[PDB]
Write a protein that binds this ligand. Structure first.
Ligand SMILES: O=C1c2ccccc2N[C@@H](c2ccccc2F)N1CCN1CCC(N2C(=O)c3ccccc3N[C@H]2c2ccccc2F)CC1
Length: 150
């Protein structure tokens, strides 16, 4: 139990994801929206998204979160897993977070252009999104969401 460990736990303790949405980056239409805290580690969350998301060249994410703790460089690493294999990875950087703030973070998620999507029916229930929450190099948490394409 190091000092860094204790700090990671403190951040996790003060962190909350309050809401999120996903929109087609071309049309701006809403594909998903929710208030479930999908960041909570240690349980498999489940979400249903319309299969048309798989035709989007990019997805626009809007994510609202609160943190009692100050963070120097809040960032995420996210991986798409299909039957346990990684098909795609993203890095997003929020940066500095004021202690006891609530913040809305906008991100653009690009589909890898050199891949071809498997169909929805094959993907559905077989895809896990693993999100790791970091402050700089400190791992705060790792959560998973299984996706159904509906
Ligand atoms: O389903 C595929 C896919 C399937 C097979 C091969 C590649 C894929 N890549 C992407 C994708 C598909 C189309 C266009 C762009 C894309 F990025 N996707 C869409 C998944 N994508 C990346 C994960 C995104 N995500 C979040 O950003 C997120 C933020 C905080 C906490 C958990 C998160 N997990 C997911 C997420 C967000 C909202 C609802 C469910 C969900 F799982 C939601 C959008």
């Amino acid at each position: 139990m190091s000092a860094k460990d204790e700090r990671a736990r403190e951040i996790l303790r003060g962190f909350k994801l309050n809401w999120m949405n996903l929109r087609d980056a071309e049309t701006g239409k809403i594909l998903w929206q929710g208030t479930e805290d999908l960041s909570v580690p240690g349980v498999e969350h489940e979400a249903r998204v319309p299969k048309k998301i798989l035709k989007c060249k990019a997805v626009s994410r809007e994510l609202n979160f609160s943190s009692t703790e100050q963070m120097e460089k809040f960032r995420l690493e996210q991986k798409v897993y299909f039957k346990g294999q990684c098909l795609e990875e993203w890095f997003f950087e929020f940066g500095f977070v004021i202690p006891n703030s609530t913040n809305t973070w906008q991100s653009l998620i690009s589909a890898a252009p050199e891949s071809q999507m498997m169909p929805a029916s094959v993907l559905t229930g077989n895809v896990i999104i693993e999100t790791k929450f970091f402050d700089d190099d400190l791992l705060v948490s790792t959560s998973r969401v299984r996706l159904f394409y509906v």
